[PDB]
Design a protein around this ligand. Sequence first.
Ligand SMILES: Nc1ncnc2c1ncn2[C@@H]1O[C@H](COP(=O)(O)OP(=O)(O)NP(=O)(O)O)[C@@H](O)[C@H]1O
Ligand SMILES: Nc1ncnc2c1ncn2[C@@H]1O[C@H](COP(=O)(O)OP(=O)(O)NP(=O)(O)O)[C@@H](O)[C@H]1O
Ligand SMILES: Nc1ncnc2c1ncn2[C@@H]1O[C@H](COP(=O)(O)OP(=O)(O)NP(=O)(O)O)[C@@H](O)[C@H]1O
Ligand SMILES: [Cl-]
Ligand SMILES: [Mg+2]
Ligand SMILES: [Mg+2]
Length: 144
Amino acid sequence: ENQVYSPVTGARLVAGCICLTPDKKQVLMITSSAHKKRWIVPKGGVEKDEPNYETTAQRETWEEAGCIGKIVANLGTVEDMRPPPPRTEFHFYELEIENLLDKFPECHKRHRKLYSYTEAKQNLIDAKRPELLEALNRSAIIKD
Ligand SMILES: Nc1ncnc2c1ncn2[C@@H]1O[C@H](COP(=O)(O)OP(=O)(O)NP(=O)(O)O)[C@@H](O)[C@H]1O
Ligand SMILES: Nc1ncnc2c1ncn2[C@@H]1O[C@H](COP(=O)(O)OP(=O)(O)NP(=O)(O)O)[C@@H](O)[C@H]1O
Ligand SMILES: Nc1ncnc2c1ncn2[C@@H]1O[C@H](COP(=O)(O)OP(=O)(O)NP(=O)(O)O)[C@@H](O)[C@H]1O
Ligand SMILES: [Cl-]
Ligand SMILES: [Mg+2]
Ligand SMILES: [Mg+2]
């Protein structure tokens, strides 16, 4: 396909965004396409031509969440551990939300909502995605 893999581990290379309000009190979440009651964050597979992970992250944040903003931090990598090597290596960025658009590519396939840190953390546990929670915890979100 168009997907890129680690030459070392064969992990699927993915990038996405922890999208925060300017006041850093809320994070943007979306429902999963697979599990429609589970709330996650925007991310997706790096494609063959893309020159950096920021490109992939901002493309997926537009496609999946209708969100435009400014990358303000590199949150490093997290690895997903497919239980009984990693098959996913995620590259996360912190984005400062500049606009949320009513219409975007996946707007009929997903719901979208801003959550406080407490609500977001319970969502990601509920979704069984501790690696996305790892990325959220590295962001400048207010954890009060
Ligand atoms: N914990 C996980 N770690 C890594 N990959 C996962 C995990 N859970 C599911 N996946 C796979 O990652 C891909 C996307 O799953 P998910 O993160 O739920 O996003 P999505 O909103 O469903 N997008 P998509 O299904 O690709 O259109 C699928 O191939 C899943 O099987
Ligand atoms: N492709 C994947 N790579 C890595 N981790 C994954 C992948 N698919 C699922 N996981 C994770 O592995 C765990 C088990 O996932 P899964 O078997 O899909 O459970 P489920 O969708 O919650 N179904 P169930 O618990 O039986 O009702 C979860 O923590 C997932 O996030
Ligand atoms: N990009 C990253 N990749 C991996 N681990 C990280 C990363 N950023 C931070 N950490 C670690 O994760 C934990 C939380 O990180 P951070 O967001 O810097 O806040 P903190 O640890 O509470 N504060 P401080 O120890 O003063 O830097 C710490 O153990 C960090 O060393
Ligand atoms: Cl993904
Ligand atoms: Mg994609
Ligand atoms: Mg995907």
